[PDB]
Amino acid sequence: TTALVCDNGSGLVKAGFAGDDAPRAVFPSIVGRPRHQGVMVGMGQKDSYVGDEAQSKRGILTLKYPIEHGIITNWDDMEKIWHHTFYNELRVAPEEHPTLLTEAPLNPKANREKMTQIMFETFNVPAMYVAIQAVLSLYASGRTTGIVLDSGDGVTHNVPIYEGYALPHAIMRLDLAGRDLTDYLMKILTERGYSFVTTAEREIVRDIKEKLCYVALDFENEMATAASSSSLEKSYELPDGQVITIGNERFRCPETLFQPSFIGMESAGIHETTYNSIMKCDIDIRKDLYANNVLSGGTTMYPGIADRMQKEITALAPSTMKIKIIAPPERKYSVWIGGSILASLSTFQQMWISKQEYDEAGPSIVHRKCF
Amino acid sequence: TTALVCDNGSGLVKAGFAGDDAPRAVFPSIVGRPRHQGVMVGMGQKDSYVGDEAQSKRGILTLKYPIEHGIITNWDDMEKIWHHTFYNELRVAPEEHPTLLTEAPLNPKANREKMTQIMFETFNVPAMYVAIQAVLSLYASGRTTGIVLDSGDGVTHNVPIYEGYALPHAIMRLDLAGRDLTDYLMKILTERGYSFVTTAEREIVRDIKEKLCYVALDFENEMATAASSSSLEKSYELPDGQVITIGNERFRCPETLFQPSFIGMESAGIHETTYNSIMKCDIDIRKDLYANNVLSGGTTMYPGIADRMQKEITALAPSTMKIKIIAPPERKYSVWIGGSILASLSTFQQMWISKQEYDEAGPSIVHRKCF
Amino acid sequence: TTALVCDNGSGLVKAGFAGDDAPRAVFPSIVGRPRHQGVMVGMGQKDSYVGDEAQSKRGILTLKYPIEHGIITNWDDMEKIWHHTFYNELRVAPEEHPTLLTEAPLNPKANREKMTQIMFETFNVPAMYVAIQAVLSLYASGRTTGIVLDSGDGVTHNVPIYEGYALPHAIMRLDLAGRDLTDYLMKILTERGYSFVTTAEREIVRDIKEKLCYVALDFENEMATAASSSSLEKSYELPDGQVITIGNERFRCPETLFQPSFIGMESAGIHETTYNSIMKCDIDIRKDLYANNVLSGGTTMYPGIADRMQKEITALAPSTMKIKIIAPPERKYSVWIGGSILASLSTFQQMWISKQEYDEAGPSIVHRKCF
Amino acid sequence: VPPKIPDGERVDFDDIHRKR
Ligand SMILES: Nc1ncnc2c1ncn2[C@@H]1O[C@H](COP(=O)(O)OP(=O)(O)O)[C@@H](O)[C@H]1O
Ligand SMILES: Nc1ncnc2c1ncn2[C@@H]1O[C@H](COP(=O)(O)OP(=O)(O)O)[C@@H](O)[C@H]1O
Ligand SMILES: Nc1ncnc2c1ncn2[C@@H]1O[C@H](COP(=O)(O)OP(=O)(O)O)[C@@H](O)[C@H]1O
Ligand SMILES: [Mg+2]
Ligand SMILES: [Mg+2]
Ligand SMILES: [Mg+2]
């Protein structure tokens, strides 16, 4: 009997059986309803397109993400996505397989309670367990200490763990992630002539960001160079022709992560939030966290982030301590790989929430010592 | 057939086989339970880290000394420490070896009774004996006369002995010791900005005290010198960088030994209690005690204590008598050396408390002539 | 010539003429700089709004407290605060009045020295005197003895005083105060969905804490009740609407004072540190300190804290002796009342720090007998 | 209570090497 490790996240759903190397099914987490009229009758027209189909027929659909910032805001779309994931992407009945969901830290409790209630009443799974999204990322590296910054697509959270003991009072969460970077890129692309407004084109802007953006090592000199020379201006092809040429917008959109004053947010960049979460920890385990910093999440896949982070942390941290930034090549699937490893352990077999316990205590069972 | 010379102490448990010159294992007497939550599974993390293993994980533990001032306040912790010492640090079964423990003078008798009862009931040792902590140090030096000042870590006592005869009526005990010096150093180090509150940082302050603090020959003169010159400015590297600068605080910590009014004590200093004890004994052996003054305990390893103490005693003593201070370099292990010597003596082979004697008279046999 | 009894504190500056009952000028100590662009011309927009002005325009400012925990971190901002207090809010020249500054106990002496230097160099006050924040609070009560626990907004310090004699060896200081309670309230309010990140919304959180949070008589009973009933949920209105309902967070926020294990601090609660300080005192003055416990400071204004404190102390203390908590209703302004009373005494008129003495001896005269 | 990890034995950091 294998275990199902689903990882909803916010933007990409990754699912696959426990004990594998890569998730078997990965697809964007969007539900797209049509908005036009429709004149041909009997064309097999559906009432809602979910999964990766909705970004293939995205011309006449209005894609609407069901998760804004970690929290789930539209439960009907989430139920649609879970149903499509179980029955059509893996074709496995949910009533004969345990489930391992992942939840961002410092989420509202109602989210977890409703997730448990839906998973136990609608899909009728035998037993499901919810885990913090960064602990599995740390599991993936094979270590037992370190501070992991899982800058996902919806929310960016920085969790330090030492010798398997997490520090709840030093968890730093910031709501700047890939979605706000995409929105800022779409806003600054109007400075050159191209205007994207409808939700269908936000996917195009997202693809442009994924394909062209890069994080500068130093910002001032690069900005000075890009405004004088012409070696950074790169071209891209839109899905109807009409090639565009992006200049200094390549490294200015990802710069927001290290300087959130662009979007008016109050907090500091991710290079200072990590140091602040480190300094909140006790004085004895700062050296080990300095030497064992770990990166994760899709949005940390930008070419040129591991060196900028190293330079900024070296600037902030004391000079004598050695600073190492772990960046595995498989950063995108690190959380799911950790979940697959966790679901295969023998000692984990008694941590699941038995359906009997839910029937006895209700959906609030998740908040108990049974996490 | 070999004898075990154990030294409980308070802070540094030292143990080893009899007849040697160095103890086998010297490790801190600390038992530290975890304090945080703990998220990673399968680490096999124990619920109690003791001894030297616990001083490597101080970040996620609450180190706690089971001995406040000589006496034992948590018998469960002391049982854990004894089990760890006998079974793991020596790899010697306790069932076929005698035991020689040490006790500070003028302590409650219930402590010795409970110690012997636990040693004979749980461990089932063949025979055990409790010896005075200072008489062993005096025996170790190869002499038989004089007054020994044993500035340990929990209790500081003065024991005068003449030609193998002790004087129970002239024993002066004060509870000022290295622990109070560490606390006072921590209290005064906040005047510059460096604040230590966590029980784990106490060990950092203790290491600072061991590596930096020293006894000034003249207190007021040195303090005036430090206010104008800058040769006392000493730098130290914290376990995470951010070096600190200690000025005149380095010789205020051991100045408490001579002026206990710093920590609120109404009693006199160490050089004065010894003088009072010497003047309390017979008038016929005062010169011999002057000629055989020997220091004991690790705390007497401060740089320059034997010179200021000699000067103070010479000033207080009559000008005719000659004052000499015997300061062996290995004063830290002197008690264990004395125990090793005593365990090897053939004349001492019949002073042990046999198992039959305990089964016949109970734990109260300790208070008898057989200590 | 009257004296200005100023009280910088940390978070709430109180000042006024000596001899009155309440300060004439009370305002939060915040220095606020603009962070947005600003396009309109001729509006008279200054570059730094301090005091109560920054509490009206906090939407477009970045408020920054200049006093973290007793210590001063921005000397120019503190200079601006003092300048606003003297020239703008009281309209009195500093050269024609003496001044009484307030300082928390066990603080770095560099802060006090630099405060005196700033006071005598910039404002050129004829004479200034620094007083401990607990002695003044004790004076305001009209008695002469007792143990005062003055938990302000920066530090929680407990000082026992007997017959006008302080005990420097029995002062216990904790860094847990109103600011950390506000941060913990911010961290626990994300469990329902309301997330506050910007430093301006921390003022809303502080207002909620002032208006709704209360200390439970018993933590476990109230926690169990709040999970079943709904009689504790109170509603609050944010400055734009969006009414929010608080359930059991009302008494979880101030419980951190008695259980610092929530925010990860190692030290014990405020109920046990005072008892430990009392036990540090001599055996002949413990009953009187039991009978005259005095509370003050803003953080002790939670409704129902005097009952929990008394119950905890009675549980810890020996049964026979009496424990009486003195909780004056106007305990918020206690330090200012004490300063006003002390500055009006004829005996104190000769204890000022004369300008010529500082001129001929430097700022370091404060640490001397004139302290 | 937080998720109290049940008492097992081991292991980690061999899986990463195996995977690589
Ligand atoms: N190769 C890449 N380069 C830059 N950004 C990327 C890349 N791949 C993904 N991203 C960004 O990361 C997001 C996906 O993050 P992901 O880790 O899937 O989030 P989640 O934690 O919800 O799974 C995408 O929205 C995209 O903006
Ligand atoms: N080299 C040193 N310099 C100064 N102080 C020391 C030194 N070594 C140990 N100490 C102090 O002495 C204590 C150890 O004393 P020790 O003799 O082990 O006590 P016990 O009598 O309990 O064995 C330590 O806590 C430390 O504070
Ligand atoms: N009525 C109240 N109820 C609860 N808490 C309060 C109340 N008034 C003030 N506080 C808390 O006390 C703090 C003010 O403390 P205060 O005594 O002014 O500090 P200081 O010693 O620096 O003057 C505020 O930050 C607030 O958090
Ligand atoms: Mg993720
Ligand atoms: Mg000793
Ligand atoms: Mg105050």
Side-chain angles (χ1 to χ4, degrees):
Chain A
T1 305
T2 53
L4 280 175
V5 179
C6 291
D7 186 299
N8 304 276
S10 175
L12 274 83
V13 163
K14 335 176 186 66
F17 311 104
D20 295 74
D21 191 61
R24 286 198 55 178
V26 283
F27 59 95
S29 156
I30 48 182
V31 178
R33 299 176 178 86
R35 55 180 173 91
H36 286 106
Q37 197 170 39
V39 295
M40 293 179 64
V41 56
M43 269 303 307
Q45 52 182 196
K46 279 195 167 184
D47 196 28
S48 69
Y49 286 74
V50 305
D52 49 359
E53 305 177 11
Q55 79 168 180
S56 175
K57 311 290 185 178
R58 65 166 179 263
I60 72 276
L61 302 175
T62 161
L63 313 178
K64 193 179 65 178
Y65 284 74
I67 298 182
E68 292 186 345
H69 306 138
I71 185 182
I72 303 178
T73 60
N74 187 275
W75 283 110
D76 186 64
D77 281 337
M78 179 48 59
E79 173 179 337
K80 284 183 174 296
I81 293 184
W82 266 332
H83 179 282
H84 174 88
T85 317
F86 277 159
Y87 288 114
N88 295 36
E89 281 305 274
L90 300 180
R91 311 175 193 90
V92 287
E95 56 272 7
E96 57 160 343
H97 265 337
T99 316
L100 173 58
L101 293 320
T102 63
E103 194 75 13
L106 293 187
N107 252 352
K109 293 184 179 299
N111 189 95
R112 318 180 68 177
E113 292 179 354
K114 280 228 59 181
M115 174 177 299
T116 301
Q117 181 178 2
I118 282 187
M119 194 59 60
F120 265 158
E121 286 200 6
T122 298
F123 291 91
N124 196 93
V125 297
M128 46 84 63
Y129 177 71
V130 175
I132 303 302
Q133 216 173 350
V135 183
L136 295 327
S137 169
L138 192 49
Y139 261 107
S141 296
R143 309 167 177 271
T144 183
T145 70
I147 160 184
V148 42
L149 170 122
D150 185 79
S151 177
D153 184 62
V155 68
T156 294
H157 56 263
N158 172 279
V159 181
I161 298 176
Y162 179 83
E163 203 65 27
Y165 284 91
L167 279 70
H169 73 273
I171 298 181
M172 282 294 188
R173 173 181 174 179
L174 174 55
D175 300 330
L176 181 71
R179 193 103 68 84
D180 289 9
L181 301 191
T182 301
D183 287 5
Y184 181 76
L185 180 67
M186 184 179 60
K187 183 189 307 303
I188 65 176
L189 264 185
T190 66
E191 293 181 352
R192 194 174 285 260
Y194 326 107
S195 59
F196 308 95
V197 276
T198 171
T199 177
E201 298 167 335
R202 202 210 280 124
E203 278 196 339
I204 299 176
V205 179
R206 175 187 68 176
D207 194 8
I208 291 179
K209 180 197 63 177
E210 295 183 25
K211 198 171 182 297
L212 279 313
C213 291
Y214 82 103
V215 178
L217 176 59
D218 189 7
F219 181 76
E220 294 282 5
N221 58 334
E222 276 293 337
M223 194 66 178
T225 287
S228 60
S229 180
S230 304
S231 59
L232 304 186
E233 310 169 7
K234 198 78 64 178
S235 181
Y236 177 84
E237 178 181 357
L238 260 47
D240 74 275
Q242 202 167 176
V243 290
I244 69 179
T245 298
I246 39 185
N248 76 89
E249 282 79 347
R250 274 166 53 106
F251 62 97
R252 193 145 66 95
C253 168
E255 178 66 16
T256 305
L257 293 173
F258 303 95
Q259 191 168 347
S261 75
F262 286 61
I263 327 186
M265 273 189 172
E266 184 75 24
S267 66
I270 71 178
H271 78 267
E272 194 159 6
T273 297
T274 295
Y275 170 69
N276 285 325
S277 65
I278 288 182
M279 80 178 300
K280 199 103 61 181
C281 304
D282 316 73
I283 203 177
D284 189 76
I285 57 181
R286 301 188 187 186
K287 175 187 183 66
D288 191 73
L289 267 55
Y290 278 155
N292 206 342
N293 201 113
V294 186
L295 291 184
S296 174
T299 61
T300 53
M301 261 291 197
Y302 292 153
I305 183 176
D307 48 333
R308 176 68 184 275
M309 176 68 56
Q310 155 83 207
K311 170 182 171 297
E312 298 286 358
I313 295 296
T314 304
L316 287 182
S319 58
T320 171
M321 256 50 198
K322 183 178 180 180
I323 300 175
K324 181 178 180 180
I325 308 296
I326 271 70
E330 67 181 58
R331 278 184 309 277
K332 289 178 52 60
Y333 301 142
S334 65
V335 184
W336 187 91
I337 290 178
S340 170
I341 293 183
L342 180 76
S344 66
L345 287 181
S346 301
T347 68
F348 186 60
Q349 237 64 43
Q350 66 277 16
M351 190 63 74
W352 312 85
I353 300 179
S354 180
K355 195 183 188 306
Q356 312 168 176
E357 297 195 8
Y358 164 71
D359 281 80
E360 297 316 272
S364 58
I365 180 64
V366 58
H367 302 343
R368 294 233 305 265
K369 189 172 296 181
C370 297
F371 224 108
Chain B
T1 177
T2 62
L4 300 182
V5 177
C6 179
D7 183 13
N8 289 4
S10 181
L12 260 73
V13 166
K14 1 185 176 61
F17 307 96
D20 302 63
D21 52 327
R24 191 66 60 189
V26 173
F27 62 96
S29 170
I30 47 181
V31 176
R33 287 159 167 78
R35 51 193 273 254
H36 289 77
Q37 184 179 126
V39 291
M40 210 159 307
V41 83
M43 295 300 305
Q45 43 227 359
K46 270 65 186 61
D47 200 49
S48 295
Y49 291 83
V50 315
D52 196 14
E53 185 182 13
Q55 210 184 194
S56 301
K57 302 179 178 181
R58 314 169 310 176
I60 53 180
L61 298 173
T62 85
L63 303 181
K64 221 153 55 184
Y65 292 86
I67 295 179
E68 297 179 351
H69 296 343
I71 81 175
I72 276 73
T73 62
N74 275 328
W75 283 110
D76 174 58
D77 295 13
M78 209 57 188
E79 185 275 292
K80 294 178 181 300
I81 287 188
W82 274 330
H83 167 47
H84 182 280
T85 315
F86 287 168
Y87 283 65
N88 298 29
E89 293 293 335
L90 295 183
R91 257 59 56 84
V92 177
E95 200 64 27
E96 58 182 35
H97 297 268
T99 310
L100 214 173
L101 306 171
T102 62
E103 177 66 22
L106 299 183
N107 293 15
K109 279 79 177 302
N111 188 88
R112 264 179 278 190
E113 176 181 348
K114 277 288 302 178
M115 178 180 300
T116 297
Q117 187 248 214
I118 283 187
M119 199 55 57
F120 268 153
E121 202 167 9
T122 63
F123 284 107
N124 307 127
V125 297
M128 67 91 56
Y129 179 82
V130 174
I132 303 179
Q133 192 179 168
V135 180
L136 258 50
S137 62
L138 200 275
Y139 268 63
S141 299
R143 340 192 66 175
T144 180
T145 62
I147 180 170
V148 45
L149 165 66
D150 185 18
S151 179
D153 196 19
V155 51
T156 293
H157 50 270
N158 253 125
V159 173
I161 182 176
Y162 177 83
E163 203 68 25
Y165 301 97
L167 282 74
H169 87 292
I171 302 179
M172 251 62 177
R173 146 159 179 160
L174 188 61
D175 29 70
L176 166 64
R179 192 96 59 82
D180 304 7
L181 303 180
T182 291
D183 263 72
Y184 182 71
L185 181 59
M186 178 186 303
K187 178 176 273 70
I188 65 175
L189 202 50
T190 197
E191 295 183 356
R192 300 199 163 189
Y194 324 109
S195 60
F196 298 101
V197 283
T198 308
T199 167
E201 299 167 334
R202 169 190 290 256
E203 307 304 324
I204 294 300
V205 178
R206 155 186 152 184
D207 176 76
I208 290 181
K209 179 188 63 177
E210 295 183 22
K211 291 298 303 302
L212 258 56
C213 293
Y214 80 104
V215 178
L217 210 286
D218 208 6
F219 174 55
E220 61 282 359
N221 157 77
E222 275 275 10
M223 183 176 178
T225 293
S228 62
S229 170
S230 299
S231 181
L232 289 316
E233 309 286 347
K234 211 66 176 182
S235 179
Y236 179 84
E237 177 178 352
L238 257 51
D240 68 323
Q242 51 166 142
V243 300
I244 66 178
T245 71
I246 298 181
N248 65 273
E249 300 84 353
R250 56 183 306 179
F251 67 92
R252 295 184 63 178
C253 162
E255 197 67 32
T256 307
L257 288 177
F258 298 93
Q259 294 178 351
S261 298
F262 291 170
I263 60 176
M265 297 298 301
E266 311 278 4
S267 301
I270 57 172
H271 66 281
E272 314 176 37
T273 170
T274 302
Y275 186 68
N276 287 124
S277 179
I278 286 184
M279 297 204 69
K280 277 187 60 59
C281 77
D282 279 58
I283 197 64
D284 187 76
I285 66 176
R286 202 148 303 182
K287 307 162 300 180
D288 313 61
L289 264 44
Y290 290 149
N292 302 136
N293 190 10
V294 52
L295 311 181
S296 177
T299 320
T300 50
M301 281 291 301
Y302 286 137
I305 178 176
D307 313 3
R308 175 181 174 89
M309 178 180 177
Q310 180 187 10
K311 169 256 198 66
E312 282 292 335
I313 296 186
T314 308
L316 297 187
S319 176
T320 300
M321 296 58 181
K322 183 168 58 182
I323 304 302
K324 186 177 286 81
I325 311 301
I326 309 301
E330 301 161 334
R331 36 197 155 183
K332 300 178 60 181
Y333 307 149
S334 179
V335 182
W336 190 92
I337 303 307
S340 174
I341 294 301
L342 183 60
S344 304
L345 292 188
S346 302
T347 315
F348 186 67
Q349 214 81 192
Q350 49 278 3
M351 289 60 185
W352 259 281
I353 305 301
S354 183
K355 177 70 67 176
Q356 301 177 170
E357 310 188 35
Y358 171 76
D359 303 339
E360 172 185 353
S364 179
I365 197 63
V366 173
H367 313 101
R368 213 97 67 178
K369 44 172 289 299
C370 302
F371 295 154
Chain C
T1 301
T2 59
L4 308 186
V5 279
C6 179
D7 170 52
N8 56 341
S10 53
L12 227 65
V13 165
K14 332 175 184 66
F17 291 159
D20 291 7
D21 320 61
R24 292 185 59 183
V26 285
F27 63 95
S29 67
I30 47 186
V31 178
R33 350 196 69 87
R35 69 184 188 94
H36 285 131
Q37 189 178 190
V39 292
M40 289 192 175
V41 65
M43 301 305 303
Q45 317 141 190
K46 296 182 298 300
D47 200 49
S48 67
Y49 307 146
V50 305
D52 191 73
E53 181 71 17
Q55 274 280 27
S56 62
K57 311 170 84 287
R58 65 172 178 264
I60 44 89
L61 292 178
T62 162
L63 271 49
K64 193 165 273 67
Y65 285 75
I67 314 169
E68 297 293 334
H69 303 133
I71 333 170
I72 311 298
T73 57
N74 282 283
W75 284 111
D76 38 357
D77 294 6
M78 198 56 184
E79 175 189 6
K80 292 185 177 62
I81 292 296
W82 277 331
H83 171 285
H84 177 95
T85 308
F86 284 165
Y87 291 148
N88 219 122
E89 205 70 21
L90 295 183
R91 301 173 178 89
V92 285
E95 305 177 9
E96 207 178 353
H97 285 291
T99 313
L100 175 69
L101 283 313
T102 303
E103 158 82 328
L106 232 60
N107 275 75
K109 53 178 181 292
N111 140 84
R112 172 157 46 185
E113 163 187 338
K114 193 161 278 74
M115 174 187 302
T116 294
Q117 170 175 318
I118 280 295
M119 215 65 176
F120 268 156
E121 290 271 354
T122 300
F123 300 153
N124 300 327
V125 284
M128 52 133 290
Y129 180 76
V130 292
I132 307 300
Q133 72 182 311
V135 182
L136 267 43
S137 61
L138 187 57
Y139 273 8
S141 180
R143 48 174 54 86
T144 182
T145 182
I147 165 182
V148 40
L149 171 73
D150 195 315
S151 69
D153 196 14
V155 291
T156 296
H157 57 268
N158 174 265
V159 178
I161 306 177
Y162 189 73
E163 301 280 5
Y165 295 146
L167 288 314
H169 68 144
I171 299 180
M172 300 302 297
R173 173 186 174 185
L174 268 64
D175 301 66
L176 170 55
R179 191 158 311 180
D180 288 60
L181 301 187
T182 294
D183 285 331
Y184 184 59
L185 174 57
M186 257 176 53
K187 192 193 69 176
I188 64 178
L189 268 188
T190 199
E191 295 181 348
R192 265 181 166 84
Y194 334 114
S195 64
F196 304 106
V197 174
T198 66
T199 175
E201 297 176 346
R202 185 157 69 181
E203 315 300 333
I204 296 309
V205 170
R206 181 174 61 82
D207 202 3
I208 291 178
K209 177 247 290 189
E210 283 196 5
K211 261 53 178 296
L212 298 188
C213 295
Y214 81 101
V215 181
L217 194 273
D218 212 9
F219 182 57
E220 290 290 346
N221 322 11
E222 286 278 337
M223 194 64 178
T225 294
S228 58
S229 164
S230 299
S231 178
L232 304 186
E233 298 188 6
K234 282 189 175 300
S235 61
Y236 183 82
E237 174 187 347
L238 303 188
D240 76 320
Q242 292 191 177
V243 55
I244 58 181
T245 62
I246 308 300
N248 74 89
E249 282 75 13
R250 300 176 53 185
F251 59 96
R252 219 197 300 182
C253 160
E255 199 73 15
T256 312
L257 284 176
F258 309 108
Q259 295 191 39
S261 171
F262 285 165
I263 61 175
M265 288 195 61
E266 186 60 274
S267 65
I270 78 175
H271 70 83
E272 190 171 355
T273 177
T274 65
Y275 170 75
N276 295 325
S277 70
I278 292 178
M279 300 295 290
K280 265 183 170 57
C281 302
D282 313 69
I283 201 180
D284 59 278
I285 61 178
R286 302 177 183 182
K287 179 205 307 175
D288 310 57
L289 300 184
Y290 282 144
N292 285 333
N293 179 27
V294 179
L295 279 71
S296 54
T299 353
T300 46
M301 280 290 297
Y302 295 116
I305 186 176
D307 315 3
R308 177 74 185 277
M309 265 267 299
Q310 184 170 12
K311 166 179 167 296
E312 233 75 24
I313 293 184
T314 299
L316 293 184
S319 176
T320 305
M321 296 189 182
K322 184 177 179 180
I323 300 94
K324 180 171 71 174
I325 267 63
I326 307 300
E330 347 84 324
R331 50 178 176 263
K332 176 176 294 182
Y333 314 141
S334 177
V335 294
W336 189 92
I337 301 179
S340 177
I341 289 185
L342 178 55
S344 178
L345 291 189
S346 57
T347 310
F348 173 71
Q349 302 294 151
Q350 302 171 358
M351 299 230 60
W352 302 98
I353 303 179
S354 48
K355 142 81 72 173
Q356 46 121 217
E357 243 300 333
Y358 152 77
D359 197 4
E360 66 191 5
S364 62
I365 186 194
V366 189
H367 305 164
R368 303 214 315 268
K369 49 194 59 181
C370 297
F371 135 86
Chain D
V1 305
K4 172 171 299 183
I5 299 299
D7 238 63
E9 70 275 350
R10 283 283 85 179
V11 73
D12 265 325
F13 188 69
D14 188 51
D15 289 288
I16 162 180
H17 169 276
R18 179 67 182 272
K19 189 156 56 183
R20 296 306 288 267

